[PDB]
Design a binder for this molecule. Structure first.
Ligand SMILES: Nc1ncnc2c1ncn2[C@@H]1O[C@H](COP(=O)(O)OP(=O)(O)O)[C@@H](O)[C@H]1O
Lengths: 371, 51, 37, 842, 28
């Protein structure tokens, strides 16, 4: 659980009122909690599992209540299963609690292994929203139709008899908002978000690449409604690395039924992509991210400078004008550096000239080369 | 019974038999895994940098 | 147990203001079958 | 050290205070003149670090006596002004304002905009620090406000002066000095601010913004805010003051949506259009259009909604060949809910009599009435279809039909009042079922009407002790929903005397719990008005005493967000100690009713209810899911559905039942696929319990209500405006469900039909000024403020382009995709009218 | 340009605040 989002950002008493509303509610929480049976069930089960209980691994289930369990010493024991253990929650590789004296299975322990993919499960999408992105409307509708609508409303596709699209590639110059759009769609539909950065699936170990992608899809399907993001797919996209490609392509198209997990893959060099990975059967949605135009640039300037204190003299149009020379990330860079420049000369209220010299210096640092 | 004091990884001692978690003990830092490359809080101070 | 909630309740209350041995017998008399410490 | 120019300025600021160490006048005029000009140069500049103020930590502290005793002429004014400008930096908040007051009054714009803002804030603080016992020291503060406010309006500081003026509580004087362009910011700001500031300041702020809107001739928004103030006389005033016929028609559409109807006189131009639109009877003609424009016209089958044709039917073969009562009632309710308002069915039209013949007992009163939901707002449609059952040989199905007749008329008003005529002669029928059906239908047909002929036909049934108790309960419920929030004495005193006379064996019976609601419905959103009533309610006995008083107090503050009343309700929920605790259970829905007016209130109530479930005794535990349902009616937030799923399998049967209802209630009409999945899983899971099967299938009907076009949200108009008739429509069902084994799973399934009082579809339909449909491309999506900080919130984010008509799920907004049209009202919800833009040119 | 002396950041974060700063950060 998390706090509500207070949506004035200028210092106004509306922001205050929302805040003291929240304080009121949390204070009622405090009040309520401070102003303060099944011993039969406990006396049977939690006394049968006499403390302490060891933790081991389940290998096989042989009978209805008989299973093989290994422990951290590595020994193997054919033990019985007490009736209260959920059989459907038991499978090879599962962590199981065991009676200390007689090693009898006394319950399943929720998994705490596979650390790395557990970290890349992130789920920490809520920093952005479709709000934070402006002007990418065509891309927004495309990705909504491809991945967001089938997750939010698969009813349309099931009623239509349609098997939903099962792969999306995002492409364009860097800093156009591909990663931002992926995070934003992860935020709009609260399906679990999976991110893995390109080259990081390339590994020294021969198996580790395909193994890593296999376990990532395994955890994704385990979370069921999930979105997996591979940024800079080019690192793999453009024998061992080709074998990781084959693993990913078969995880996309191949045997079994994948189900609900969606795949977003972002590239900066789409034309260098190999034909196999761009599967017409799987990857039917390619979304271009062009360099922002005048309207989009204006929207990005408003979005980013919105949280900054601004003077009256700022004429945003001369910043917007000229051509499509730069992307949204460059716009954020101009906003930030204009903030610093206003800070040096001691303005907490950035002016037009600040942005003018900021864009000039950025264009100086933008590209290079002898005449 | 002060379980809320028991954060993860507090290096907390048991009893030799029946385990029966005993008491917190001091923490485990000795970050030699990081100290192989980390410099902690270094020694250099702006005074012996000149020019 | 009470809590402030002083965010709005303080102004709410200041608006509600509108709606608002020595002679003891140290001579204890006893009996023939009387306990005496 | 400091740079050469910095050293020069520091030396100047230094010997400008070194000289001041004595009486000489060559200090007070000249040196203070130099200080004034330099400080003016520093402060007027945008430099956020006025250089003299940096140096002046060794401040004037030695110069207090001479500052005080010197002549009040230009020297004292100069010293006070300098110390005031400096004092915004030191901890001299109490004394900076006094320095400015005793110094030269000047103009605040002379020093600096930040100086003006800080002085304005100081004025706001000193207004609250000043006692209310006197009104003389407030004039000096007003002599600053009178110029601070126009300066703020000139300098794009709308929210600053709005806050300033609500702090001094004197909002009256924003309604004069506003520009034609700056009005949007301020009105939207107070419109956002009203939901949080407590009574009665919120209402005064509302009427202030309404005055601003009238002064800027924004009649539709003025009527919208008047409806916020739920005073039909104010709405009548603005309606009469209107000067546009099409704007009047648009606001009549808004009134019909809100469920408010007021009489019109012959002077009302184009009488028939306004009267019929405000009577809403046109809705069906529009609705069947939208349905056929998206071709959902085929009526769905409850079995197909269950889709037994595809699941592994593990109850089948020999053990399915019975038309058992319970699942038949569930199927009838599903057919009513899913095929509601579409005016047609394939199951109970061709096999109308035949399906009825295979139900039994209370199903007849239910199943027949089910047809009324299918035939919504086609009064002459249903009214031609219920006749075959108005003279049915069966009696219970006659009771269901006599309620369906009224339920068809729900939400619409007819000049003929056909339902009144039909059900007038049966409100005293000898058989309890006939009377019950008649009275429930008639109450549903006239919820929110407040007309006294029906109320005076209803009220004698209170004293009619010969009528079974549930008849009295339904009578109180009908009187409540017919007169919502009006606090009319004629109803209120009668129902108070009705609830005053019941005895112990009557106060504890199953249906008496509705009678307080009948009182509370008459006091919706009126707050302290219950305080005068509450004095009588204490005469009755505990635990029924606390039950009734807490329920009516909750109804008095429904949607208000009054955190003090929520605190008292929490105290009611905190008495740790089961029938006597039933008064706690109502209290649970209390935190719903108050907190369901704001997004932050709802989302914080969500976190409160989790802990309350963790700690609650069964009376609170069973009550919680109902309140959870009311927080997000027809708004299936995932963080609510997951909790309902985790508590749908509770060993407590009633907790499970309430969670199962909350499933369909939160996702009502949303046709959510995931919620349908968990409902199918529950149906194949709880197949061993007819009660849980019936509840799960009822929830499946609820979520598929109107096939997706229909919802039960009591709020409307960008979720800021609530419809009291809808609030009652949910509230009766939700308070009834507190004893689901006896009320709903027991004898009174018909009670669910109360939600039809809240029946409203969610869509956009665009018309031209002739009011014929005009399909127009629009931009649809969520609502956020983004670059709007205390300003414009118009942002349809993550949008699609859709040609009207389009359905609008909870949280959805639409905007004109092209500016080639101008809307009659800049709130695009419900039926809206467009006009060609003449200012726009090719 | 000289670096931000402690007094300079002090006045930067004091002069530029609204008359609300203290309340809303304390409330946070
Ligand atoms: N349309 C946009 N709206 C808002 N921010 C944008 C937009 N485009 C780019 N940005 C900025 O650029 C960054 C995202 O760059 P992105 O193109 O997603 O990286 P990558 O090229 O690695 O996918 C974000 O910090 C974001 O603020």
């Amino acid at each position: 659980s998390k706090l509500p989002l207070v949506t004035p950002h200028t210092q106004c008493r509306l922001k205050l009122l929302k805040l003291e509303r929240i304080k009121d509610y949390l204070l009622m929480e405090e009040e309520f909690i401070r102003n303060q049976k099944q011993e039969e069930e406990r006396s049977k089960v939690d006394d049968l599992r006499g403390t302490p209980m060891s933790v081991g691994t389940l290998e096989e289930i042989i009978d209805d209540n008989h299973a093989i369990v290994s422990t951290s010493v590595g020994s193997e024991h054919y033990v019985s299963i007490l009736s209260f253990v959920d059989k459907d929650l038991l499978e090879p590789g599962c962590s199981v609690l065991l009676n200390h004296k007689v090693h009898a299975v006394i319950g399943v322990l929720m998994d705490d292994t596979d650390p790395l993919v557990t970290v890349m499960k992130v789920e920490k999408a809520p920093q952005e929203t479709y709000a934070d992105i402006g002007g990418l409307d065509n891309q927004i509708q495309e990705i909504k139709e491809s991945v967001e609508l089938p997750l939010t409303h698969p009813e349309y596709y099931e009623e239509m008899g349609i098997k939903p699209p099962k792969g999306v590639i995002l492409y364009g110059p860097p800093g156009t908002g591909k990663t931002l759009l992926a995070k934003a769609v992860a935020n709009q539909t609260s399906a679990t978000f999976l991110r893995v950065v390109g080259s990081e699936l390339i590994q020294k170990y021969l198996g580790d690449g395909p193994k890593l992608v296999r376990e990532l899809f395994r955890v994704a399907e385990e979370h069921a409604p999930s979105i997996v993001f591979i940024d800079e797919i080019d690192a793999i996209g453009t024998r061992e690395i080709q074998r990781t490609m084959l693993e990913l392509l078969n995880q996309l198209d191949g045997f079994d039924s994948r189900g609900d997990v969606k795949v977003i893959m972002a590239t900066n060099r789409i034309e260098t992509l190999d034909p196999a990975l761009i599967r017409p059967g799987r990857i039917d949605r390619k979304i271009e991210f062009p360099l922002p135009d005048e309207k989009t640039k204006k929207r990005i300037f408003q979005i980013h400078t919105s949280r900054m204190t601004l003077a009256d003299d700022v004429t945003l149009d001369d910043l917007i004008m000229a051509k499509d020379d730069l992307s949204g990330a460059d716009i954020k860079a101009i906003c930030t550096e204009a903030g610093l420049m206003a800070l040096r000369e001691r303005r907490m209220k950035v002016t037009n000239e600040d942005f003018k010299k900021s864009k000039e210096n950025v264009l100086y640092k933008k590209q290079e080369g002898t005449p | 019974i002060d379980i809320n004091d028991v954060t993860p990884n507090c290096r907390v001692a048991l009893r030799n038999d029946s385990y029966t978690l005993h008491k917190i003990l001091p923490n485990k830092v000795d970050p030699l895994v990081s100290l192989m490359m980390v410099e902690k809080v270094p020694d250099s101070t702006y005074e012996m940098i000149g020019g | 147990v009470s809590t402030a909630v002083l965010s709005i309740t303080a102004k709410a209350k200041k608006k509600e203001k509108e709606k608002e041995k020595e002679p003891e017998p140290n001579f204890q008399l006893l009996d023939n079958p009387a306990r005496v410490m | 050290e400091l740079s050469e120019e910095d050293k020069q300025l520091q030396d100047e600021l230094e010997m400008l205070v070194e000289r001041l160490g004595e009486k000489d006048t060559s200090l007070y005029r000249p040196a203070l003149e130099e200080l004034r000009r330099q400080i003016r140069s520093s402060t007027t500049s945008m430099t956020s670090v006025p250089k003299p103020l940096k140096f002046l930590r060794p401040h004037y502290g030695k110069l207090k006596e001479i500052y005080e005793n010197m002549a009040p002429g230009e020297n004292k004014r100069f010293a006070a002004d300098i110390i005031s400008v400096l004092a915004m930096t030191m901890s001299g908040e109490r004394e900076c304002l006094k320095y400015r007051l005793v110094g030269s009054q000047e103009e605040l714009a002379s020093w600096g905009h930040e100086y003006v803002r800080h002085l304005a804030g100081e004025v706001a603080k000193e207004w609250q620090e000043l006692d209310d016992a006197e009104k003389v020291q407030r004039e000096p503060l007003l002599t600053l406000v009178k110029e601070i406010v126009p300066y703020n309006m000139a300098h794009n500081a709308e929210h600053e002066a709005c806050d300033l003026l609500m702090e001094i509580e004197q909002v009256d004087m924003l309604e004069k000095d506003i520009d034609e362009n700056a009005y949007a910011k301020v009105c939207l700001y107070l419109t956002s601010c009203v939901n949080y500031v407590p009574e009665p300041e919120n209402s005064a702020l509302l009427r202030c913004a309404l005055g601003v809107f009238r002064k800027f001739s924004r009649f539709p928004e003025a009527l919208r805010l008047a409806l916020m103030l739920n005073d039909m006389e104010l709405v009548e005033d603005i309606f009469t003051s209107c000067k546009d016929v099409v704007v009047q028609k648009q606001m009549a559409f808004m009134l019909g949506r809100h469920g408010v109807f007021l009489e019109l006189s012959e002077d009302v131009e184009e009488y028939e259009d306004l009267t019929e639109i405000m009577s809403n009877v046109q809705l069906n003609s529009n609705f069947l259009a939208l349905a056929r424009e998206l071709d959902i016209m085929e009526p769905k089958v409850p079995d197909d909604i269950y889709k037994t044709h595809l699941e592994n039917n593990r109850f089948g073969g020999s053990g399915s060949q019975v038309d058992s009562a319970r699942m038949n009632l569930a199927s009838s309710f599903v057919n009513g809910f899913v095929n509601a308002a579409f005016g047609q069915d394939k199951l109970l039209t061709d096999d109308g009599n035949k399906w009825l013949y295979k139900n039994k007992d209370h199903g007849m009163l239910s199943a027949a009435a089910s047809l009324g939901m299918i035939l919504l707002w086609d009064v002459d449609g249903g009214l031609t279809q219920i006749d075959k059952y108005l003279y049915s040989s069966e009696d219970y199905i006659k009771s269901g039909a006599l309620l369906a007749c009224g339920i068809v008329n729900s939400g619409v008003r007819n000049e003929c009042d056909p339902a009144l005529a039909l059900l007038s002669d049966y409100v005293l029928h000898n058989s309890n079922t006939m009377r019950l059906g008649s009275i429930f239908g008639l109450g549903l047909a006239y919820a929110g009407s407040n007309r006294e002929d029906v109320l005076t036909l209803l009220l004698p049934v209170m004293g009619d002790s010969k009528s079974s108790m549930e008849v009295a309960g339904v009578t109180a419920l009908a009187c409540g929903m017919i007169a919502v929030g009006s606090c009319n004495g004629d109803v209120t005193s009668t129902i108070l005397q009705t609830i005053m006379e019941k005895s112990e064996t009557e106060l504890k019976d199953t249906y008496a719990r509705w009678l307080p609601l009948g009182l509370g419905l008459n006091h919706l959103g009126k707050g302290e008005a219950i305080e005068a009533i509450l004095a009588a309610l204490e005469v009755v006995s505990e635990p029924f005493r606390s039950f009734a008083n807490t329920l009516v107090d909750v109804c008095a503050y429904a949607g208000s967000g009054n955190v003090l009343k929520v605190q008292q309700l929490l105290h009611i929920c905190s008495e740790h100690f089961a029938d006597m605790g039933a008064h706690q259970g109502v209290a649970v829905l209390g935190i719903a009713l108050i907190a369901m007016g704001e997004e932050i209130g709802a989302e914080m109530a969500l976190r409160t209810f989790g802990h309350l479930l963790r700690y609650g005794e069964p009376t609170l535990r069973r009550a919680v899911p109902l309140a959870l349902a009311l927080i997000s009616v027809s708004n299936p937030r995932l963080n609510i559905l997951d909790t309902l799923s985790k508590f749908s399998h509770d060993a407590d049967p009633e907790v499970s039942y309430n969670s199962i209802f909350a499933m369909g209630m939160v996702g009502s009409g949303t046709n959510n696929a995931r919620l349908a999945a968990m409902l199918r899983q529950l149906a194949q899971y709880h197949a061993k319990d007819p009660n849980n099967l019936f509840m799960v299938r009822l929830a499946q009907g609820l979520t598929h209500l109107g096939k997706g076009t229909l919802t039960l949200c009591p709020y409307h108009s960008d979720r800021q405006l609530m419809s009291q008739v809808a609030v009652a429509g949910l509230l009766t069902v939700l308070v009834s469900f507190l004893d689901v084994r006896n009320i709903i799973l027991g004898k009174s399934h018909y009670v669910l039909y109360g939600l039809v009082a809240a029946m409203q579809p969610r869509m956009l339909v665009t018309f031209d000024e002739e009011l014929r449909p005009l399909p127009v491309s629009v931009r649809v999506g969520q609502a956020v403020d983004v670059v709007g900080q205390a300003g414009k919130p118009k942002t349809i984010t993550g949008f699609q382009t859709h040609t009207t008509p389009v359905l609008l799920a909870h949280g959805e907004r639409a905007e004109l995709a092209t500016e080639e049209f101008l809307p009659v009202t800049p709130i695009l919800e419900g039926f809206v009218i467009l006009r060609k833009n003449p200012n726009y040119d090719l | 340009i000289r670096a931000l002396d402690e007094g300079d950041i002090a006045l930067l974060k004091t002069y530029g605040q609204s008359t609300y700063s203290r309340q809303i950060k304390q409330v946070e």
